[PDB]
Design a protein around this ligand. Structure first.
Ligand code: HEM
Length: 146
């Protein structure tokens, strides 16, 4: 039932994944500015959050994030099926220097972007559904922090 709530809500945002993911990342850096230096491209550090939004590579990474979320939505009823992919994704992020602790801020940023996009439509069952999906995704990724 909640899996339908996820599919329904994702529909709207999935249509413009970069615009929506841009909200997610803007929120993320507003909450935890210390994540900005972890995006090292061309050996350089972004000075300010707005610098990231001018970077092709950074915007590409937004698209990657939204693609993975889309995969979880696709498999919302399965999700044993992404276990291995997510475990390795966690390993990768550990390697680029993301702390597992920062996953919750990412979660809050996702939930923020959904709330702002859905407005009246982001009902508390909708929040709860997404909290439990995202939490599941993070459980899988956390295996990669070994
Ligand atoms: C604090 C949050 C995050 C940071 C700092 C971060 C940073 C990075 C960095 C630096 C890379 C490698 C450079 C690049 O490909 O652009 C990367 C790759 C990637 N990220 Fe993230 N990321 C974050 C969250 C996420 C989330 C939540 C997802 C998906 C749910 C995601 C999906 C990806 C994917 C698919 C790749 C390509 C990885 C590979 O196979 O090599 N990221 N991320």
């Amino acid at each position: 039932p909640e899996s339908e709530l996820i599919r329904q809500s994702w529909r709207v945002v999935s249509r413009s994944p970069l615009e929506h993911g841009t909200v997610l990342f803007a929120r993320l850096f507003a909450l935890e500015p210390s994540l900005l230096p972890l995006f090292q491209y061309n050996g350089r550090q972004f000075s300010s959050p707005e610098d990231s939004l001018s970077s092709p590579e950074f915007l590409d990474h937004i698209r990657k994030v939204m693609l993975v979320i889309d995969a979880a939505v696709t498999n919302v009823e399965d999700l044993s099926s992404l276990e291995e992919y997510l475990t390795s994704l966690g390993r990768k992020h550990r390697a680029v220097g993301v702390r597992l602790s920062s996953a919750s801020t990412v979660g809050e940023s996702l939930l923020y972007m959904l709330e702002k996009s859905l407005g009246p439509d982001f009902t508390p069952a909708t929040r709860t559904a997404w909290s439990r999906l995202y939490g599941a995704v993070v459980q899988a990724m956390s295996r990669g922090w070994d």
